[PDB]
Amino acid sequence: GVEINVKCSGSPQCLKPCKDAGMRFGKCMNRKCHCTP
């Protein structure tokens, strides 16, 4: 279960493990963002 949010662009928190595409679409930590802006 890695979908606890649909509004959290806390980049090194979501983006540190997803330092691959964009900064957001869903959750930061637990879910390291669904990085599709």
Closest CA to 29 of 13, 18, 10: 13
- The dihedral built from the CA positions of residue 27, 28, 30 and 36, taken in this order, carries a sign that is positive
Q: Looking at the DSSP assignment, which residues form a beta bridge with residue 29?
A: 31
**32 Cβ neighbours under 8 A, 6+ residues apart:** 13, 14, 15, 16, 17, 18
DSSP code string of 4-15: --S----HHHHT
**Contact status, residue 33 vs residue 6, Cβ threshold 8 Å:** no
Q: Which residues contact 4 (CB under 8 A, 6 or more apart)?
A: 27, 30, 31
